[PDB]
Amino acid sequence: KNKTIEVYVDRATLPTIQQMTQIINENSNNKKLISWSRYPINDETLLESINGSFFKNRPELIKSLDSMILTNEIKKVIINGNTLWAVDVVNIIKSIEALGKKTEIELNFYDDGSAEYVRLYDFSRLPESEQEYKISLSKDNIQSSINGTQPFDNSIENIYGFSQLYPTTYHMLRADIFETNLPLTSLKRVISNNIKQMKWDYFTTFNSQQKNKFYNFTGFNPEKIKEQYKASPHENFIFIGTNSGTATAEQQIDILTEAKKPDSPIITNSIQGLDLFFKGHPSATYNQQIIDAHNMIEIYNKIPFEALIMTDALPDAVGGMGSSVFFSLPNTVENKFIFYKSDIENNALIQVMIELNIVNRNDVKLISDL
């Protein structure tokens, strides 16, 4: 009983990309069980190089996990998951504990995107006593879910409340959220020793083989985009697109025509004279309409922007639509404007982004502004 199994799960993309990067950085030979919704790995050479198995779904992964634990050889399981979707790690914990094999469990939660930060803002609006009360309930909430007596509510106090039960690290998009004007002292006390700031400078220390492993995992290689950046000597701008749940194609086309004016009263930070790139949202299907109307260099929409970040393929400047993308973007890239579908003072997404200095209050715009 000296073996550790590492479990990797995610429904989105950001935790997956960060999880891939940690696996590569650590280069451990522990057995790994992997289930990533957006990144099915069928590459057996890749999987063998990390000692991994891939599972198409959570119940299959759990089945293999449990049989391994039944061998009596498993000292510890490290579960790596998605904070918003902590429910998936709850069900993994439930299955391990049920077996009653005295398995050590340790947890790494990676933020999903903007949702955690919208929820943190909302939670910070609560009076302090109500925050403390919700927190007081969290340990029992989580334990009841693990015991199987109640469903799991992914409220702030619950998803950030696991360090009360297990050795837990929260890898956060912006760990410095607890150092803004938001009243979050109540939650900070719970997790202050359990927080890591997500890092994006791994490639600075990676050797070639590590870099190549990242390309192989993601199916992304930054060579084409890096050539596109340098093709012309002008500074590079990426427009961050959204999907129809937030904006129409026409509204984004209109935003781009306003931005191209050197003297807009709305978009004061002009994109005139820049090399313009369009990065579409992975789920948008109107990207060609926008790209054509503006003669923009296309960055394939299915590439998650965090792959651009991790591979150091960043532009000089950025602007566009309210998005999780802006939360992981390094602060060295200039943010010219963000448009929101939204009275901005009551908008949690806008306010958290202002508080984190992701965007100047003067550069926040509403789609109704054109």
**Any contact of residue 232 with Cl ion (CB under 5 A)?**
yes
SS3 68: helix
Among Cl ion, ligand C5P, Zn ion, none, the one that 84 touches (CB under a kind-dependent 5 to 8 A) is none
Phi then psi for residue 111, to 5 deg, are -50, 145
- What is the pattern of x (binds ligand C5P, CB under 6 A) and - over residues 168-207? ----------------------------------------
Beta strands 334-340 and 236-240 are unpaired
β-partners of residue 79 are: 7, 107
- Cα 134 to Cα 72, 150, 155, 169: the distances in Å are 38, 16, 9, 21
SS3 319: strand
> Of 92-100, 147-155, 277-285, 334-342, which segment contacts ligand C5P by CB under 6 A?
277-285
- What is the pattern of x (binds Cl ion, CB under 5 A) and - over residues 253-292? ----------------------x--------xxx------
**Any contact of residue 368 with Zn ion (CB under 5 A)?**
no
**Any contact of residue 285 with Zn ion (CB under 5 A)?**
no
Q: Are 9 and 89 in contact (CB under 8 A)?
A: yes
**Any contact of residue 367 with ligand C5P (CB under 6 A)?**
no
Q: Are 99 and 70 in contact (CB under 8 A)?
A: yes
Identify which of residues 232 and 272 has a Cβ nearer to Cl ion in the complex: 232
Query: DSSP label at 201?
Result: -
- Nearest distance in Å: CB 342, ligand C5P: 15
The helix, strand and coil proportions of the chain, stated in percent and rounded to the nearest 5, come to 45, 20, 40
Q: Quote the strand ranges of 114-242, DSSP E.
A: 168-172, 195-197, 236-240
Among 7, 8, 11, 13, binds ligand C5P (CB under 6 A): 13
> Of 91-99, 168-176, 190-198, 274-282, which segment contacts ligand C5P by CB under 6 A?
274-282
Annotated binding residues for CMP, written as ranges, equal 241, 279, 281, 305-306, 323-324
Among ligand C5P, Zn ion, Cl ion, none, the one that 335 touches (CB under a kind-dependent 5 to 8 A) is none
Q: Which residues bind Cl ion (CB under 5 A)?
A: 232, 234, 236, 243-244, 275, 284-286
